[PDB]
Design a protein around this ligand. Structure first.
Ligand SMILES: [Ca+2]
Lengths: 331, 743, 55, 333, 44
């Protein structure tokens, strides 16, 4: 029985020494020719109000105009980020929501929460009801108008089919609560973070884990993508954003600072990739420079824990939503 | 006995729903327990961490016993068959009357049974209540470290609020160790370690009362103590001479080397077998320098003696929460009495209404509130053997006259209690004249019924027994009291008698030498008189001298007589069964309970207690005094003592005055010392009840519990005890001896 | 516990035999992307306030 | 049977020494001086009370300018006082609270320190200038020879002369048996004395680096030792309540300043400027002026609560300053 | 511990050959030092 653990240890030692031999340079050293960015000032322009309880998640429309905001009081308001007009107010039959999504087209909106089922709407009425998770729902992302991928707290991810309500591929291979997941911009292979301090990279075709990533010491609350689909930034609960590589299977940069002790909630990259944004428990949001590992600004307007943060598709605005039932659109 | 361990599911955490009934609020928190087993912390609704002291948790109940929501909004939110198997309520409070409910519904299956069981296993530990001074000083550190603010930092209002006596010394001792010291600032929790906390405690208050101890042993000019200078401190001052020197041997130097290796930070003296002046101040609060040994606190008693040879915790009219005349009867006190260590509760049953036959429990003709009998029997069957598996004695006070309800309550007690009732006598002890009662070892986990078989208030005018309710009463059968020379001739040990206090104080003074001989075979029970409408308490040490087992006391009021009753039953595993001394349970060896001289057969003792000093005793600048009472036989009772009031000169006051001299105690195995610290002005601070037959001698730390025997965190006292063996009109002569014990 | 003990030694074996380009080349491509696409990134560059959709 | 010859050669030379001492023993100081006048009633007064520390006070030192004084506390915070107008002109925090000594420069620029952490942290008049490591025990006392030399006395039975710029042990003084507790420099700044625990003070020369006159006599520790102002005598305060007075040119003990009603040890001795009064502080919270030429008490300086752990006269005799274990420091005149 | 007895008697032999100034002249030098310096002590 122990010989299996010995050959597994030798097999992962072949990952260890190949990581060491592939670590020949350092991105903290290559960027020393690059001139810094310095001061970046963002300001509140649209304060979307109208909720009653704490906001748990949000997602931007594909045309960067409408955004859905899932609050704890059983409500999915779909706003207009240009004129501040509540286009819809969707009442769900469950109080505890954790996630909400939007469509690549712009007609479907998913949700989910503690009731273990992913309610898909239509733009209103529930169209489909997706049951089959043994634990609660954490985060859900559409692929197209017919497919969704969900991440549950019973140590798995699932890939559904909307028209038939059947789980196509069930990604298992974790051993902790999958708290967040993020999708590639071309929607071919996605990532998933857990409460094991280990990100994984899954694919939607073969259903297998191709790469694994370690490094943290706590849960992983947020993952985004570099906008070309080659890197990702696992924001965690020990105040350390990182940056990884899909090719070298190695961590590249770490965004750590004293006077930042609180764990973090939601990260997001920029449209180019020079910036990074994170949301902290100390009610603030610190723009990190993605190459020189220094701050560039402070988005401090919130009065409670910044629970969700999202950047548009044309890169113009960011939108934050915290536990004080308010959303703020910075520009 | 086992140290408090926290399993790896409570440290990693679990998700819950903290719901609430009055505010109708709800939140999804994650409960954790720190690895010392000290607190229960969860992130609140605005990121400020809340705590619950785990030594204040009275009970954690789960399943059908947990509280259900009574508001349809919260019931619609939560999901309201087996969804109520994920509920959990944790109760907490200072006293049995005033408790506060914390409601936690789990979001995952099976994370409520373990989360309630492993909190009740942690809240009912012995080594977490009799912890030393070092543990109670590392608890106040964790209370500061876990209560971070919204950023994740130990704030500076907290360290000014915990040590809230003065404010100049706190900010100066913060600035003198390299920390931040303003009024609105914060300290990062990785630059505020344990050593940076104790080096702030040492700069906080000055300690000359340990300088005197080090001068007395010879620490003259060197900044250390040798090995022999510590071994001949332990074996000369910190050794109680009453123990036999063969099975409790003195200290070898190899054990003092282990003590030096454990308690000393400096590496110079650690290799030359020497101990510094900080490695001694860390020894005086050590786990080996305790005021009581760990054999006077666990279940170590001959539990095979008959049931008439034990003091038994008892209560009288348990259902009330206030005075007897305008109170409000509740079912929760049956839980908070049987969990607290009681073993005999009273049921004042009454006759139901012609709507439907249901017996209810209330005080008769007093306009109180009425609770029903079935819920009370449900509570008694719930919280019976959760703390200690020793037999409860249900003392019914029957008042139903209709034959329907007398058969209703005979099936209530047979369907609710089930197999835990005693309906038939045992195989070894039949109900014959001349047999002894069965031991509490042989009645483990049974419930005995006390009811009639075929100035007192409403306990005199009872209702005669029927053939249906009196099938239950076999071993504890109450009769009417004739005389001791009449009860002695019958030789039936399976009866008892119940005296009111005014009628018990007429054979206490008259003929106690027959009274002690009566309490060697049969039981007794004393309830206070019906004129105490404010629920006052008589002294139980009046009737514990003559031998009375079931001395019943009001549990809702906490005066001195209830503090002694709740402190004397903490020992012997909190089981509510304390053994009698040997001359109150032997048949031939009689003695006088009012004697003024020592008795041949009982080794006397002598006790000298000197109050040195004590720390962190208040939260404002006011003086402190200390009362050292002593209860027991009426010749050992001396409550006149009191130190002088200090001036509040520091965090710790020092008292410079003569010792207190208890030169002769006639029966040491029954007496108990009461050290209670007060403020100047009558305010209470803390107290502790220590048995004299197992107290230790030397320089020790007394850790003061509060008014209802729960451990306070910061305050303590340092005393010097010296305990050693002794070296050599009647109704007024016996009623002037009890003038100190009565009040 | 045993089928998982074969699944893990399969999962590490299918991970170990992959192509691992150097961190110098990866950081070179990652650095080359940012200023090549920074001309059309409205977070670093300020906004013409007439064409700003939120002002 | 070879070590018995070395042991008998050891003890016979002790006999040859102790015969040469009683060969010079002719009289005593009291029998010689017994026609001199007494001193009388020396009634003193607390001039200033320098509050400001937060723990015990283990050592102090007077400046050579007779105006400023340093006083090493136990929280790890030296304070340099201005004895005329009571203002704390300096307040230097340390890295280790357990401090057993301090010093002051003859120039007035370098204040040293020490304690339980084996090092001597020379400061500049503020920041750490050096960290003199190399001892394997606690550092009991350390004194300034000049602005370039310092001489320590550590608890590993060794004294040492150091170099303040390179930080190396220049000359090493070895030959004791117990922990070295106190030390004092002569007025010609070329020889000191080392009062270790085993009832024996020795006489070291700083240039040849080896002992030349070893005294015995006590039965306890030696917690203090301080020179007469001519560089010919000193006084070794001890733990069995016996202040002595030895002579350098005679290599014998002259007086013993014992008493009845006193059984408490000494923590600090010092002579005066005139060499008439032997000010000594006791471990029972009281200082007693000993008349040095008649071995009798002459003044009582008792105003401290806990024990008096450090005492020092100035270099013109105008003041004497005591510091005790109750975080207060008084200047007596 | 063989050379320690030689190292002891070396310092003893160095202690032996020194000068022997008498106690009467030493105490007279002490009194002559005190009587010539008792004019500049502000305590006295
Ligand atoms: Ca009653």
């Amino acid at each position: 029985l122990d010989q299996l653990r010995q050959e597994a240890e030798q097999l992962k030692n072949q990952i260890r020494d190949a990581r060491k031999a592939c670590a020949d340079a350092t991105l903290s050293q290559i960027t020393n020719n690059i001139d810094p960015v310095g001061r970046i000032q963002m300001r509140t322009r649209r304060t979307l109000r109208g909720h009653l309880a704490k906001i748990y998640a949000m997602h931007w429309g594909t045309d960067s105009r409408l955004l859905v905001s899932a609050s704890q009081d059983g409500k999915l308001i779909i706003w207009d980020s240009y004129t501040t007009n509540k286009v819809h107010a969707i009442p769900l039959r469950s109080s505890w929501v954790m996630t909400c999504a939007y469509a690549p087209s712009g007609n479907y909106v998913a949700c989910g929460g503690l009731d273990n089922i992913c309610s898909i709407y239509n733009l209103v009425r529930v169209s489909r009801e997706l049951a089959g998770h043994t634990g609660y729902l954490s985060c859900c992302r559409f692929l197209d108008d017919n497919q969704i991928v969900t991440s549950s707290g019973d140590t798995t991810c699932a890939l559904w089919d909307i028209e038939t309500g059947q789980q196509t591929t069930t990604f298992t291979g974790h051993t902790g609560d999958v708290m967040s997941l993020s999708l590639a911009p071309d929607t071919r292979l996605f990532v998933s973070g857990a409460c094991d301090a280990s990100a994984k990279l899954w694919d939607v075709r073969e259903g297998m884990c191709r790469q694994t990533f370690t490094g943290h010491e706590s849960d992983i609350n947020a993952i985004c993508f570099f906008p070309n689909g080659n890197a990702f930034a696992t924001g965690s609960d020990d105040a350390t954003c990182r940056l990884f590589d899909l090719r070298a299977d190695q961590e590249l940069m770490t965004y750590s600072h004293d006077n930042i002790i609180c764990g973090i909630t939601s990260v997001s990259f920029s449209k180019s990739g020079r910036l990074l944004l994170a949301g902290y428990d100390d009610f603030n949001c610190n723009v990190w420079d993605a190459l020189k590992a220094d701050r560039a600004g402070v988005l401090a307007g919130h009065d409670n824990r910044v629970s969700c943060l999202g950047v548009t598709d044309d890169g113009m605005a960011v939108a934050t939503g915290s536990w004080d039932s308010f959303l703020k659109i910075w520009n | 006995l086992e140290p408090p361990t926290v399993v790896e599911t409570l440290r990693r955490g679990s998700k819950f729903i903290k719901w609430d009934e009055e505010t109708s609020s709800r939140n999804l928190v994650t409960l954790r327990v720190d690895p010392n087993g000290f607190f229960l912390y969860w992130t609140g609704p605005n990121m400020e961490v809340d705590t619950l002291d785990i030594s204040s948790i009275r009970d954690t109940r789960t399943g059908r016993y947990a509280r259900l929501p009574k508001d349809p909004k919260i019931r619609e939110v939560l999901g309201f068959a087996r969804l109520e198997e994920k509920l959990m309520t944790v109760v907490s409070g200072p006293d049995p009357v005033n408790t506060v409910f914390l409601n936690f519904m789990a979001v995952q299956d099976d994370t409520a049974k373990v989360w309630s069981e492993e909190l009740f296993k942690l809240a009912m530990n012995i080594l977490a209540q009799n912890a030393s001074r070092n543990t109670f000083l590392r608890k106040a550190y964790t209370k500061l470290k876990l209560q971070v603010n919204q950023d994740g930092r130990i704030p500076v209002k907290n360290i000014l609020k915990m040590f809230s006596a003065d404010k100049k010394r706190v900010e100066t001792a913060l600035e003198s160790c390299g920390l931040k010291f303003n009024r609105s600032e914060s300290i990062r929790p990785d630059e505020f370690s344990l050593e940076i906390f104790e080096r702030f405690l040492n700069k906080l208050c000055l300690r000359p009362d340990i300088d005197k101890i080090l001068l007395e042993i010879g620490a003259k000019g060197k900044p250390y103590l040798t090995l022999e200078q510590l071994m001949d401190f332990i074996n000369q001052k910190q050794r109680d001479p009453r123990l036999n020197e063969v099975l409790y041997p003195p200290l070898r130097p190899s054990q003092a080397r282990l003590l030096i290796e454990k308690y000393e930070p400096n590496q110079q003296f650690l290799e030359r077998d020497q101990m510094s002046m900080e490695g001694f101040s860390r020894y005086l609060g050590g786990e080996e320098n305790g005021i009581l040994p760990l054999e006077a606190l666990d279940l170590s008693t001959d539990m095979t003696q008959p049931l008439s040879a034990y003091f038994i915790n008892s209560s009288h009219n348990t259902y009330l929460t206030a005075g007897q005349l305008a109170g409000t009867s509740s079912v929760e006190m049956y839980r908070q009495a049987l969990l607290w260590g009681c073993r005999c509760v009273e049921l004042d049953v009454w006759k139901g209404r012609p709507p439907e036959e249901e017996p209810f429990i209330t005080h008769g003709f007093t306009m109180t509130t009425e609770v029903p009998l079935r819920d009370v029997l449900e509570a008694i069957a719930e919280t019976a053997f959760k703390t200690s598996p020793y037999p409860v004695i249900l003392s019914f006070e029957n008042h139903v006259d209709s034959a329907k309800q007398q058969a209703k309550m005979a099936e209530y007690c047979r369907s609710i209690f089930g197999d835990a009732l005693l309906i038939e006598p045992l195989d070894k002890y039949p109900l014959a004249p001349g047999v002894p009662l069965p031991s509490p070892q042989d009645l483990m986990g049974r419930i005995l019924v006390k009811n009639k078989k075929r100035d007192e208030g409403t306990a005199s005018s009872e209702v005669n027994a029927t053939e249906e309710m009196s099938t239950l009463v076999n071993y504890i059968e109450p009769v009417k009291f004739k005389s001791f020379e009449a009860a002695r001739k019958r030789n039936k040990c399976f009866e008892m008698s119940s005296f009111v206090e005014t009628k018990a104080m007429e054979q206490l003074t008259k003929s106690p030498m027959e009274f002690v001989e009566y309490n060697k075979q049969q039981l007794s029970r004393i309830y206070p008189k019906g004129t105490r409408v404010d629920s006052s308490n008589y002294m139980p040490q009046l009737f514990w001298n003559v031998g009375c087992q079931l001395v019943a006391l009001n549990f809702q009021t906490l005066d001195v007589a209830m503090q002694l009753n709740a402190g004397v039953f903490e020992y012997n595993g909190r089981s509510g069964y304390l053994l009698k001394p040997e001359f109150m349970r032997r048949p031939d060896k009689s003695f006088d309970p009012f004697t003024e001289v020592i008795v041949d057969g009982i080794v006397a003792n002598a006790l000298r207690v000197k109050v040195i000093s004590g720390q962190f005793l208040s939260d404002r600048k006011v003086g402190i005094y200390v009362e050292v009472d002593m209860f027991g036989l009426p010749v050992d009772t001396r409550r006149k003592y009191r130190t002088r009031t200090s001036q509040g000169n520091s965090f710790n006051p020092v008292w410079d005055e003569e010792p207190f001299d208890f030169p002769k105690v006639v029966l040491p195995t029954l007496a108990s010392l009461r050290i209670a610290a007060f403020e100047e002005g009558g305010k209470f601070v803390g107290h502790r009840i220590l048995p004299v037959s197992a107290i230790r001698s030397g320089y020790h730390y007394v850790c003061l519990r509060n008014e209802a025997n729960q451990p306070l965190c910061l305050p303590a006292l340092l005393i010097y005890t010296e305990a050693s063996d002794y070296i050599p009109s009647l109704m007024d002569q016996r009623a002037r001896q009890l003038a100190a014990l009565i009040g | 516990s045993i089928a998982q003990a074969r699944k893990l030694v399969e999962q590490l074996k299918m991970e170990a035999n992959i192509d691992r380009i150097k961190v110098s080349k990866a950081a070179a491509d990652l650095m080359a992307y940012c200023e090549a696409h920074a001309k059309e990134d409205p977070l670093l560059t300020p906004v013409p306030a007439s064409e700003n959709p939120f002002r």
